[PDB]
Amino acid sequence: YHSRTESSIENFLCRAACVYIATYASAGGTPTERYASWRINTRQMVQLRRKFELFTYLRFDMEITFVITSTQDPGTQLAQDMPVLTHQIMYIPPGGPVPNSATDFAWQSSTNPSIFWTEGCAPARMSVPFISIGNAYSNFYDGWSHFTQEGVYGFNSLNNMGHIYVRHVNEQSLGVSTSTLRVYFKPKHVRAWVPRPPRLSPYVKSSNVNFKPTAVTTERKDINDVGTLRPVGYTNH
Amino acid sequence: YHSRTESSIENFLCRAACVYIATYASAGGTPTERYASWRINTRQMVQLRRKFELFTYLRFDMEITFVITSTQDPGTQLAQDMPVLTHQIMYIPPGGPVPNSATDFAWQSSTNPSIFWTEGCAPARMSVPFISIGNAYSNFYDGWSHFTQEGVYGFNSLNNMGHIYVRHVNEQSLGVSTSTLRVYFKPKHVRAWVPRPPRLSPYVKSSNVNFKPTAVTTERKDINDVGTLRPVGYTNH
Amino acid sequence: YIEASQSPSSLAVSVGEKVTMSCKSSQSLLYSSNQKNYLAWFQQKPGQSPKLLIYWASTRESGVPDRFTGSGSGTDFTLTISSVKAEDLAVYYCQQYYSYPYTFGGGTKLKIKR
Amino acid sequence: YIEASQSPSSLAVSVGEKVTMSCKSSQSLLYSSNQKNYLAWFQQKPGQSPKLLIYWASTRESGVPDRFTGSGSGTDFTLTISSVKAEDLAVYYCQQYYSYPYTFGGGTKLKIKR
Amino acid sequence: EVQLQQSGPELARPWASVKISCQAFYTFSNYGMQWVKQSPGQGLEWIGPFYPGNADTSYNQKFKGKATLTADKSSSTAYMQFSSLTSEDSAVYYCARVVATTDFDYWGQGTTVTVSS
Amino acid sequence: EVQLQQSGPELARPWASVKISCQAFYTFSNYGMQWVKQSPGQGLEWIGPFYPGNADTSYNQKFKGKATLTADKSSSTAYMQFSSLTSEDSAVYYCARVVATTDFDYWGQGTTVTVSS
Amino acid sequence: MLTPGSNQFLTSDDFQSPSAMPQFDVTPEMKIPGEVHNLMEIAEVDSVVPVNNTKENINSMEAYRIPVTGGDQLHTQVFGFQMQPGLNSVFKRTLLGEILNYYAHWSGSVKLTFVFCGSAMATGKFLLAYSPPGASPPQNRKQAMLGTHVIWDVGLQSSCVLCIPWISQTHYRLVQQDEYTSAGYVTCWYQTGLIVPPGAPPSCTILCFASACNDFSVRNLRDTPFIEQTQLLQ
Amino acid sequence: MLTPGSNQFLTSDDFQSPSAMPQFDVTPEMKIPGEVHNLMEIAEVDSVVPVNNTKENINSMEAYRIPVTGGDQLHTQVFGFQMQPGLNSVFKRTLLGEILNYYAHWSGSVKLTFVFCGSAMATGKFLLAYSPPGASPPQNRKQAMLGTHVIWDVGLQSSCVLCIPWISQTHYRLVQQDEYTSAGYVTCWYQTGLIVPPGAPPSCTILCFASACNDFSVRNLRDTPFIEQTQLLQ
Amino acid sequence: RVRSITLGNSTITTQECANVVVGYGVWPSYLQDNEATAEDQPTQPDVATCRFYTLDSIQWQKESDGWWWKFPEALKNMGLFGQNMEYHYLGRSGYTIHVQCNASKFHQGCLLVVCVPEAEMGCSDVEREVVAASLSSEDTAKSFSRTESNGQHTVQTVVYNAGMGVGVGNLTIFPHQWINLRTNNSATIVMPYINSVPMDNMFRHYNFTLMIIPFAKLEYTEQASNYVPITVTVAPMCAEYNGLRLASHQ
Amino acid sequence: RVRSITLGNSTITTQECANVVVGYGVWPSYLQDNEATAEDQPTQPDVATCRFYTLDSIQWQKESDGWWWKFPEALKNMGLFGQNMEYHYLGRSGYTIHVQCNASKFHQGCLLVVCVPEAEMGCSDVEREVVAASLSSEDTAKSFSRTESNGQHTVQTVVYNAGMGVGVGNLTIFPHQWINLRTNNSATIVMPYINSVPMDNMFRHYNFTLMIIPFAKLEYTEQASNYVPITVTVAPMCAEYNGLRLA
């Protein structure tokens, strides 16, 4: 009697996976270097993508944990008295305002939930519920966005998970301060429908299912081939 | 689980055996060549002796059968018309008159039972009861007949049964008719006591138990030797 | 010991007839490990040296004609002569070379009957 | 079956020169657990009984000169003699003892160049 | 360096069964002995191994149904029995023997079985 | 077809030793020779061989403690020593020799050793 | 009251996180057919086994078909392989093999179904043989007959089912293990030969399906070895 | 009415004969102890077996004694013989042997008893082994151990019993016909050896008895071969 | 033995009693008020959508590779269904699919019939995209190929990858059946409505793909019919469409 | 355990445990009225006839062969039994024989003791016969011989033919007992009256013979007794004699 409790959907898909690693400075520089942005999608981490693409429809809540590690950056006019750093983490729902640079107005919108995190404490966590117009997420979509056979093929507008933005609240007068963000994504209360056969050919694109024709398995020397064998001895003789 | 009915005493000591063969003439020759005499004793047929001497005491009747075959001897003045031959068979109990020749008076006694047999019919048969003073015949007797420890050793005991005498009745003027007598002796209702080990050395005397020192059994090649032979090859024989 | 008995008497037949005779042994004469029968068929000219005819009881001696053929397995060992002759007057021995004692048979003389 | 092919031709070099030879095999003979190669370097003296030089293709037999060395693993099996001689003429074989049959080598007679 | 002997060469005849014995001077615990065929045209060819202490007798598939093997441990001998012999079987048979599952360190002497049809 | 000869017939006497030689015309490798007793009433009886190449000398058990054997392979001469010579030991001694392991292929000539007391 | 290790981020912990979008009434769910409660419901469906992947058919469907031919040969093998799912090159790409390859320990038995793709007028026999883990594969028909075997008749029946048992010392065996000559062997031998009437094609084909039985289970999830990319796509 | 075969003399028939001497009153029977009713009671008693007969002991009482040498006898054989009663040289003189030799067919079990005539301070072990008719005798202690055997410890028990079974295809086996490799063998082997204290003798003796068991029977009486004479004595 | 099915009173089919694979375990059924977010009552056209639509017969030859149809576009011109796919906006239906092969007792073959839900297919040229013409024809059956295609805007028609990017041998996880000409010549599949929304537009979204793939090649003796005819039949069930009436009082 | 037996109030015997073999199964018994038809009635004088007569002791050595007595002649000149033997013409009696060895735990050997009824013996010279002197001494034990005997009127004394002509290994058919110095120490044999007539003369007739044959030789170390004593004790029972008074 062997238990079957580790192979359930929950115990299979509820593993935290580092899905995004980014870096962003604090002091003056090119504006696009002063904030970190990530669009939520389970289609760029190939291992997690192959785990997810084993089913057709999925329904889950999202738990996101952010790990931030910052150090001073070498240069002239260094600081000796930097009190403490504070980071702002922003979740933008689909259709909400999206900042185009640091020190923008969109960082003050009351509709986008924010977390103000000061270094030294435990990593910041949030949990997004199942937000969608439809009734489930679809890994595969065979159709078009518009009903007149025009638009991107295989793109469903219903599923969208938003964006995540990170910036330095501190306006640091002297010294550049580089920070590193690692995102940990994990579904909870996972429901899966319509199992599908797992993929065979390597992924080439993050938006299509395009592929190259690969072989079905690894070659063998002959049809009636069982290698290793046994040398003559106490048993084989 | 097999029956034991052919190893019993009755089925072991009741087989007819030819214990005496004699020849006697009819007209010519010395008187001692005109009759056949035999003293009944189980001490001259070595097979019957060895089977009887397996026990010590025996008690049995006697059934005796006589087979007589006669011819006409070669010569001159030979007979041509002799009708038939009639023989006389005479049983002499112990302590009875015994003829010393043919035509003797003793052949006409009224105490000796006689059988007159004409040739051509079935053989003459007779049966004698247990004639003894004691209560059983003794094969082995350790002692002497006389109380003064002198006499003959193991001899002249009560084991006396009688004599048998056969003669011709027809007086023959022409020719001589030679005849042959075969005696067949069997016990009936035999009872045996005190079993003894079977003999090992061959018999040497018809009255004693004397013997030569004989080896206990036949030779053998080795003490730890069974059949499995060795053939002599490139090995040490 | 290990011995064998020769045929009870001689051939005592007229010349020119194929003869089949036998030699009985007093113990087994087959080495089942080698499937070998340790016995041979002998012959001794009166006044001269002996010489065998069939050795191993299955193959005739080289230089001996085909008429003498020995056969047999186990204790029994037989022989057949396709044509008896008056110029083979000798004694036939059925000897076993198993081991010493290398005892012989009894002998089979070819007497006169003609 | 499991056979092997010796060098295409004999040494055909002068006396006193080192010789490097190969005996390719139709099947690999390296076993993971034993970490040993089941092939032996043989040497058959002309007219006498054979005798190998190296067994396991890495352990020189007690009684083998330092000149002969076996090498090679798997399908490849090579031989190296630091000095060829004239009086040790033989026919070098490579006999495997991996599995039935115990197939021998290809044959290599030491020819004459002098 | 322990020696080894066998029956020896005889001049046989066609269809004459020839057993070639082999003496012993060793121990009989998971050790073995077999033979070879030294023919200049046929190179080196084994025929069938016996395994004393193991009771395993096999043959080359080129002679199955032709040759058999027998042995005696107490007598310390091994025998190849032949059947339906041909005239081209004449070869120098060496009694190969080894105290090992995998080695050939003791070799035979030689045996000639040339025939004359 | 090779013959075989030996010492020769001497008319001996009881209690007079008779050493019977025997030459050879073959080799001395694992081959052997023995003798037989040619007597009309006693048939044929072996007496005792010795085996060159084996160092095995054996005698008949009826003659155990009576006869011995001694010979030299380089001498190529085979004695047959005998003791306690009686009057009934008369026989025509054949020197049989065999190159097979166990056979009786080749035979001698014959010697008369009849004695008179 | 508190250890310094009480405040940490452990990647394998399950503590409820505060909600970021409350008062958001989620869309009610609907009954979509085809729900999955366990991945073991995926590993018990028959999939075609490429038994004929002889280095020239892996670029075609020819690998999926085992070819049986009619002729005078009688004692020749049909096919043969080793029964170690998840590592054997035959099974490692089917559904059973891949669901095994996600995990590290497994235990159970495997069902194999053979189907005869041939004419309706063909008639023959086969001698499907199985060898225990501690043995060598049979070499000829006689040795395979004396072991554990089954005579499949393609006349009375069109399909044959064979259930490999579960033999091991420990509780869970490994997926990748130094498993030499100690796992098992399944072979097929010609018994009589393929017979056809005048008009039926001589040759035929055999297909094989492999699935897991009801005792089957796995443990110790890990990463699959088939993925070979470490860069985020695009 | 009468065939010519009605008047004949058949020497194996029972017919009442005319009484020669009637009016004769026989002597009354008396009670003589030790009456025999059947000959099997003669066989059932125990008799000594001359095991050690080697052409020099049959003319002495050394024939019965089985030597057991003391010292470091590694694994030698104490004795060994073949169980065909009535024909084997050792069994053809005892009481059972003679009774069997009188008849022609026999069927039953033979009981062997070994007694150890030795010192009271001698200790050791012996291995008594039995090999059925269809097998070769063991040649060393190991093969004797692998078969049917009893370990007789002279220290604990001074007597051993072996009851040979009855194995044959037919009901009765002929008394006198040679069956090699079809008789059965008994062999004794040194297990440890005889260990003695200072003062006891270092050698001993073993005696053997052989007797028929309860289930024994004979058939077809005939004449014995041992007796030879054909002339009437004197 | 034989039986008749007179759906729509205008179509009759004869089949023998055999086995049916009923989708994922659920029979097609009407959408209830619980599942509908829209309160508007859906109208149910059942007069002519519940009949047998026999498509064209296809020829299975010795060198064929496979075929796919895309549903629900395969019935674009078939009867009232074709009119109602155009005159409405939201639709929903299930299907019954019969596949039959007309072969004698001397042929050989083994088809696999599958119904793949939302079979997203990839382009031949890796970087570019596909067009709507390549994916499906209105009623003609597109086919795979044995070798790799090298088109610009065409689907990858390699049979041993099914175009879907997955090994073909693993396709048996989907609703499927096997046609073995030795014993069987008919497969019946009942496919319910599988989608993430209660109602979807007919023209925009291909609900699923019916694929027939021969795993064992056809074989026949020289003097026999060169091909095997395959016939496909489709019957819609439980068709529900949007409403076109003023819910608010007028 | 140890027990003492006092028969006739004039004898003592000490013995612990002895297995008893009672003849052929019948105990000695007085003659009953069924088989008595002689001139006069029997008499039963048992005053001093029932007591233990201790015969002389014999020395079992390394090179001894056997010993053998003839009863009732072995008690010809011993007490009231000898007196009644001389006086009365007829007789009848049974016997009880105790044989006891005196050996330590460092001696080894084995003995067979048999009672042979009517052991008719053979002469050394086959043609001639035996004499009463050789057939039995007064009460001493005649001994067998390892080799042949060369006398003229002397019994054959080879031990492996028992002096009777039968194998010595087949003497176990008679009443017998085995004495093994390893385990056993004493033998007791009760012999009833075995004869073909109810009464017979004691002087001329030798009812039976007592034989003691060592199958296993006596072996000992240098430092021990170079002999083992053997002692024989008899005790007649149910002794009858003819009446000597007028009817």
Author numbering:
A (entry chain A), B (entry chain 1): 56 to 292
C (entry chain F), D (entry chain L): 1 to 114
E (entry chain H), F (entry chain E): 2 to 118
G (entry chain C), H (entry chain 3): 5 to 238
I (entry chain B): 81 to 330
J (entry chain 2): 81 to 327
Lines quoted from the article behind this entry:
Echovirus 3 (E3), a serotype of human enterovirus B (HEV-B), causes severe diseases in infants. Here, we determined the structures of E3 with a monoclonal antibody (MAb) 6D10 by cryo-EM to comprehensively understand the specificities and the immunological characteristic of this serotype. The results of our cryo-EM studies revealed 6D10 bound to three different types of E3 particles, the mature full (F-) particle, the intermediate altered (A-) particle, and the procapsid empty (E-) particle, resulting in three different maps with 2.8-, 3.2-, and 3.2-Å resolutions, respectively. According to the structure of the complex, the 6D10 attaches itself to the viral surface along the edges of the pentameric building blocks of the virus and adjacent to the twofold axes, a binding location similar to that of our recently reported antibody MAb 5G3.
More interestingly, we obtained two distinctive conformations for the E-particle with an additional round of 3D classification, named E-upright and E-sideling. The differences in the position of the binding of 6D10 seem to have given rise to the two conformers. Although the overall mode of the binding of the 6D10 to the E-upright and E-sideling particles at the C-terminus of VP1 and the EF loop of VP3 was comparable to those observed for the F- and A-particles, the 6D10 shifted and moved away from the twofold axes while binding to the E-sideling, which may have been caused by the flexible nature of the C-terminus of VP1, resulting in the rearrangement of the structural elements. Such a rearrangement of VP1 probably created even more steric hindrance and interfered with the binding of the virus with its receptors, because a comparison of the footprint of the 6D10 on E3 suggested that the locations of the paratopes of 6D10 were very close to but had no significant overlap with the binding sites of receptors such as FcRn and CD55 of HEV-Bs. Notably, two units of 6D10 bound the E-particle near the icosahedral twofold axes, which was different from other HEV-Bs, indicating that the E-particle was more immunogenic than the other two particles and could possibly serve as a promising candidate for the development of a vaccine. Importantly, our structures of E-particles bound with 6D10 revealed for the first time the nature of the C-terminus of VP1 for HEV-Bs at the structural level, which to date remains unidentified for most picornavirus due to its flexible nature and largely disordered properties. In addition, the highly immunogenic nature of this region in the E-particles makes them good candidates for the development of a vaccine.
